Design an enzyme around this catalytic site. Structure first.
Site, PDB file in Angstrom:
ATOM      1  N   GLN A   1       6.759 -15.238   7.743  1.00 34.80           N
ATOM      2  CA  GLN A   1       7.580 -14.936   8.480  1.00 34.80           C
ATOM      3  C   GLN A   1       8.665 -15.821   8.864  1.00 34.80           C
ATOM      4  OE1 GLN A   1       6.145 -12.450  11.977  1.00 34.80           O
ATOM      5  NE2 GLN A   1       7.904 -13.450  12.629  1.00 34.80           N
TER       6      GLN A   1
HETATM    7  N1  LIG Z   1      -3.360  -5.324  -3.789  1.00 36.87           N
HETATM    8  C1  LIG Z   1      -3.916  -6.573  -3.265  1.00 36.87           C
HETATM    9  N2  LIG Z   1      -3.371  -6.625  -1.955  1.00 36.87           N
HETATM   10  C2  LIG Z   1      -3.650  -7.926  -1.368  1.00 36.87           C
HETATM   11  C3  LIG Z   1      -4.146  -9.077  -1.842  1.00 36.87           C
HETATM   12  N3  LIG Z   1      -4.166 -10.125  -1.134  1.00 36.87           N
HETATM   13  C4  LIG Z   1      -3.709  -9.492   0.063  1.00 36.87           C
HETATM   14  N4  LIG Z   1      -3.522  -8.112  -0.069  1.00 36.87           N
HETATM   15  C5  LIG Z   1      -2.847  -7.490   0.922  1.00 36.87           C
HETATM   16  O1  LIG Z   1      -1.386  -7.526   1.243  1.00 36.87           O
HETATM   17  C6  LIG Z   1      -1.321  -8.009   2.557  1.00 36.87           C
HETATM   18  C7  LIG Z   1      -0.966  -9.065   2.623  1.00 36.87           C
HETATM   19  O2  LIG Z   1      -1.868  -9.587   3.794  1.00 36.87           O
HETATM   20  P1  LIG Z   1      -2.127 -10.820   4.313  1.00 36.87           P
HETATM   21  O3  LIG Z   1      -2.998 -11.769   3.578  1.00 36.87           O
HETATM   22  O4  LIG Z   1      -2.140 -10.778   5.734  1.00 36.87           O
HETATM   23  O5  LIG Z   1      -0.718 -11.687   4.021  1.00 36.87           O
HETATM   24  P2  LIG Z   1      -0.212 -13.037   4.528  1.00 36.87           P
HETATM   25  O6  LIG Z   1       0.340 -14.120   3.365  1.00 36.87           O
HETATM   26  O7  LIG Z   1      -1.200 -13.551   5.557  1.00 36.87           O
HETATM   27  N5  LIG Z   1       1.196 -12.866   5.423  1.00 36.87           N
HETATM   28  P3  LIG Z   1       1.456 -13.496   6.938  1.00 36.87           P
HETATM   29  O8  LIG Z   1       2.204 -14.884   6.690  1.00 36.87           O
HETATM   30  O9  LIG Z   1       2.744 -12.449   7.336  1.00 36.87           O
HETATM   31  O10 LIG Z   1       0.190 -13.400   7.770  1.00 36.87           O
HETATM   32  C8  LIG Z   1      -2.429  -7.176   3.157  1.00 36.87           C
HETATM   33  O11 LIG Z   1      -2.166  -5.602   3.225  1.00 36.87           O
HETATM   34  C9  LIG Z   1      -3.461  -7.498   2.220  1.00 36.87           C
HETATM   35  O12 LIG Z   1      -4.649  -6.728   2.191  1.00 36.87           O
HETATM   36  C10 LIG Z   1      -4.371  -8.898  -3.401  1.00 36.87           C
HETATM   37  O13 LIG Z   1      -5.093  -9.985  -4.184  1.00 36.87           O
HETATM   38  N6  LIG Z   1      -4.309  -7.715  -3.815  1.00 36.87           N
END
Ligand SMILES: Nc1nc2c(ncn2[C@@H]2O[C@H](COP(=O)(O)OP(=O)(O)NP(=O)(O)O)[C@@H](O)[C@H]2O)c(=O)[nH]1
Ligand SMILES: [Mg+2]
Lengths: 264, 159, 140
Positions: free
Chosen positions: B54
């Site tokens: 973010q």
């Molecule tokens: N369908 C799907 N959802 C995924 C996949 N990887 C992560 N997600 C989901 O999409 C969202 C992303 O989560 P997250 O991994 O925390 O994202 P991030 O890159 O860490 N974001 P931040 O920088 O804000 O922490 C969550 O709801 C997670 O479960 C994937 O391969 N497939």
């Protein structure tokens, strides 16, 4: 022992290196804390660089290093930019398995957290307030007290977890708990009166709580307390059909007599 | 080996990291900060810095650039509106002197979703073909299944 | 008006009234200059004395000593002397048990980590966190 600012900020640049020496690095952190305690002014830029070096130490699992990191975070919270970077690490540690780290983490987290970001951590705060480990519970309560300044409307919402904590057998926890409650309820006269009425019966087990609660009661009774502190507090309270004997009876003693006499 | 994993918020960076560390799919919160973890793969210990995507945090990645041997750039393959933005972030990241020789591994992620862009499509949109100055690779992944993750660690270890 | 905010500051001064440790928990002495001025002031008043209590600068100062060191808890004249006293005792006992030794400039400088962490266990932003020395020692 006696050292220069620039040198230490320099050796702090070893933190950016991977094979971390916990002992050494923690020593350097100590040098930084000392420089700061001594009153040495660090600039925004050099502070920020050192802060961001310190964050890299979060890779090390050494406990003493971690603790020194919490300290460093609280001490540089106001002199360094973008301290928000540690928010995740601290929410982690605070929610983590190891209680030695939990209370301290809450404290540090709340130090670097601002009224804008408060919402993100509220859930964990409410959780820590009701924890069974007094370290954690107390840390979260005092933390919330501090946070009452920047953001009042978010913290008032926490009166429930607070009240739950105010039943604690732990004397510190009870103290902080009732303290926090007052700090929120102060200025709503009704809720204060209720507050008082509540502990007039089934009173408290905390001397500190006792003292502060007496002080609360004083806004427009019983000196049988088994703690010196409460008896005195009561007494000094009463004198602003009296019974000023107990003061005089305190007048004979080591260093308590200053309090007695000082009154009047 | 030192690894920096970044990408826009919700790309799946933490999901990836804890799948790799715990073999588990955890319930993430947005990362306001970093997570740093060590992962063993085939005699390499990768120290992965997952740094939140973010905006406020995005502004802070540059402090994690130095000493980075390899960069994992996670992309949500299902989000077409933000692909240009990803391209913009990544392009100027490529201009960073501390990132100059670091191995560049793109994860096109959430490949499990029906309309996910393909890795080839993503490669065109991110401009990956135009990197001649260092090693790059794109890998389709699904962090929840674990698909493509270790193929990534494999490629990375061959820097 | 009642508050959880009791402790105004915590000091540890050497024989020259120079600063081994200090925390100021509010805005009374805004800058280091006037802080160090305060510290000299109170050292000059309290050096080589057992009287464990003083009114100075309109503040209650509670204090005690060891070979080369002075320990001070400072609060408002309107606070409860015995509560300040529980802070000072906590700090000194805690430091003893920690060091397993007589508490003196040499020993104390030998471990600054411990001191920092301990003071941090004792007072949070002017609030008394733990009054029990053993609890404090445990948390390091
Ligand atoms: N369908 C799907 N959802 C995924 C996949 N990887 C992560 N997600 C989901 O999409 C969202 C992303 O989560 P997250 O991994 O925390 O994202 P991030 O890159 O860490 N974001 P931040 O920088 O804000 O922490 C969550 O709801 C997670 O479960 C994937 O391969 N497939
Ligand atoms: Mg993340």
């Amino acid at each position: 022992q006696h050292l220069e600012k620039s040198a230490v900020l320099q050796e702090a640049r070893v933190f950016n290196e991977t094979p971390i020496n916990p002992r050494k690095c923690a020593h350097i952190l100590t040098k930084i804390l000392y420089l700061i305690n001594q009153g040495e002014h660090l600039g925004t830029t050099e502070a920020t660089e050192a802060f961001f070096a310190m964050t890299k130490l979060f890779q090390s699992n050494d406990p003493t290093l971690r603790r020194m990191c919490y300290l460093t975070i609280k001490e540089m919270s106001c002199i360094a930019e973008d301290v928000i970077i540690v928010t995740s690490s601290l929410t982690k540690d605070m929610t983590g398995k190891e209680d030695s780290y939990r209370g301290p983490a809450v404290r540090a987290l709340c130090q670097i957290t601002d009224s804008t970001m408060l919402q993100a951590i509220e859930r964990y705060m409410k959780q820590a307030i009701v924890d069974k480990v007094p370290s954690v519970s107390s840390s979260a309560l005092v933390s919330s007290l501090h946070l009452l300044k920047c953001s009042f409307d978010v913290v008032k919402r926490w009166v429930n977890e607070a009240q739950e904590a105010a039943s604690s057998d732990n004397i510190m926890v009870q103290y902080h708990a009732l303290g926090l409650l007052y700090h929120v309820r102060k200025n709503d006269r009704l809720a204060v009166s209720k507050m008082i009425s509540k502990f007039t019966r089934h009173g408290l087990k905390s001397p500190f709580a006792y003292c502060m609660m007496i002080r609360v009661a004083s806004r427009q009774s019983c000196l049988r307390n088994k703690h010196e502190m409460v008896v005195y507090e009561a007494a000094s309270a009463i004198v602003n059909a009296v019974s000023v004997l107990q003061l005089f009876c305190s007048s004979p003693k080591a260093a308590l007599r200053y309090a007695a006499v000082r009154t009047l | 080996m030192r690894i920096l994993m970044v990408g826009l918020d919700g790309a799946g960076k933490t999901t990836v990291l804890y799948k790799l560390k715990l073999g588990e799919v955890i319930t993430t919160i947005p990362t306001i900060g970093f997570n740093v973890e060590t992962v063993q793969y085939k005699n390499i210990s990768f120290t992965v810095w997952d740094v939140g995507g973010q905006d406020r945090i995005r502004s802070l990645w540059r402090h994690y650039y130095r000493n980075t041997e390899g960069v994992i750039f996670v992309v949500d393959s299902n989000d077409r509106s933000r692909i240009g933005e990803a391209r913009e972030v990544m392009q100027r990241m490529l201009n960073e002197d501390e990132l100059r020789n670091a191995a560049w591994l793109v994860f096109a992620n959430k490949q499990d979703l029906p309309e996910a862009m393909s890795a080839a499509e993503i490669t065109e949109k991110l401009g990956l073909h135009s990197i001649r100055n260092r090693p790059w690779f794109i890998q389709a992944t699904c962090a929840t299944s674990g698909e493509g993750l270790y193929e990534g660690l494999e490629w990375l270890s061959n820097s | 008006e009642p508050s959880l905010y009791t402790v105004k500051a915590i000091l540890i001064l050497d024989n020259d009234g120079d600063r081994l440790f200090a925390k100021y928990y509010d805005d009374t002495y805004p800058s280091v200059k006037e802080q160090k001025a305060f510290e000299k002031n109170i050292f000059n008043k309290t050096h080589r004395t057992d009287s464990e209590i003083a009114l100075l600068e309109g503040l209650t100062v509670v204090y005690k000593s060891s070979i080369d060191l002075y320990f001070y808890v400072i609060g408002s004249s309107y606070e409860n002397e015995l509560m300040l006293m529980t802070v000072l005792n906590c700090l000194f006992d805690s430091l003893s048990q920690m060091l397993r030794k007589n508490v003196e400039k040499r020993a104390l400088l030998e471990n600054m980590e411990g001191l920092f962490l301990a003071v941090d266990e004792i007072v949070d932003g002017g609030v008394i966190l733990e009054s029990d020395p053993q609890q404090v020692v445990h948390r390091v």
